[PDB]
């Protein structure tokens, strides 16, 4: 995942995979579950001042803020002419990571 407007993958691509499991049904996709992995890698890499925009780091978190809380995302029709609208207000998002070094902070 990466911030919008870059070569990297977009956050909306996550919902695209969900549609496939739901037979491309928006009603069924608006009540599914999602398990994000490697969430500990998007953490700021000792760049709190934000000298450069962490598209692969902080940039991913910013885009996911509205996704976890709930927002009508525009997912590609299949995988831009239609931009199917999928509401993520009732979709659960699980985040799994290793957080190597977090023990020192605690």
């Amino acid at each position: 995942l990466t911030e919008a407007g870059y070569v990297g993958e977009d956050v909306e691509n996550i919902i695209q995979k969900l549609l496939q499991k739901s037979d491309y049904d928006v009603q069924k996709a608006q009540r599914g579950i999602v398990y994000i992995d490697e969430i500990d890698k998007i953490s700021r890499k000792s760049d709190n001042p934000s000298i450069t925009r962490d598209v692969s780091g902080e940039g991913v978190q910013q885009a996911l803020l509205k996704l976890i809380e709930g927002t009508v995302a525009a997912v590609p029709p299949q995988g831009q002419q239609e931009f199917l609208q999928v509401d993520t207000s009732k979709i659960l998002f699980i985040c799994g990571g290793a957080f190597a070094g977090l023990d020192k902070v605690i």
Binding site: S46, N48, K104, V105
Partner: protein, 192 residues
């Protein structure tokens, strides 16, 4: 040489020398003969610590056979000027100037190790030249002696006459004796 230590922080590991590491903890070392150059380092450190936390105390470890009076006075004035209370701990020994700075700490925050000696004596000087210049320098040192006795009397709490008679010649005091005299307030034997 001075060893290097690593401090663990949330951001990451950082390398600092042994003395710099203790500086972050508001600890200042006063070792060796007191002079203008070493005095400025102490003054700069004390001023730097005041800005970081003008409320937390500052610890000053005194271990030296005295030194120049002018250089020592700069530390004393800085110690009294800065709002933070400066706690003085005597390690090994504290000569005339070292003892003056030891007793110049905040009330109730002047400590000394169980096995340490405190020495106090009148200022030592000297000048060679014309008789007219001798009187000028002779009177100047006399004023310093009187001024230092007044300051020591105020901190120790004893009468000015007592300080003059006791400081007329070299006087050695132990840790328990320093407490009774008033140079220090307590003795640190073991960590509770």
């Amino acid at each position: 040489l001075v060893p290097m230590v690593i401090e663990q922080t949330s951001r990451g590991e950082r390398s600092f020398d042994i003395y710099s590491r203790l500086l972050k903890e508001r600890v200042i070392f006063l070792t060796g003969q007191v002079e203008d150059h070493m005095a400025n380092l102490i003054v700069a450190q004390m001023l730097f610590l005041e800005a970081e936390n003008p409320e937390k105390d500052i610890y000053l470890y005194i271990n030296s056979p005295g030194g120049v009076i002018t250089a020592g006075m700069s530390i004393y004035d800085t110690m009294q000027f800065i709002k933070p209370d400066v706690s003085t701990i005597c390690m090994g020994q504290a000569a005339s100037m070292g003892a003056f700075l030891l007793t110049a700490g905040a009330k109730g925050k002047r400590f000394c190790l169980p096995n340490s000696r405190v020495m106090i004596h009148q200022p030592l000087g000297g000048y060679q030249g014309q008789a007219t210049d001798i009187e000028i320098h002779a009177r100047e040192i006399l004023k310093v002696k009187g001024r230092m006795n007044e300051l020591m009397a105020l901190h120790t709490g004893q009468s000015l006459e007592q300080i003059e008679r006791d400081t007329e010649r070299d006087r050695f005091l132990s840790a328990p004796e320093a407490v009774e005299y008033g140079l220090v307030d307590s003795i640190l034997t073991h960590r509770n």
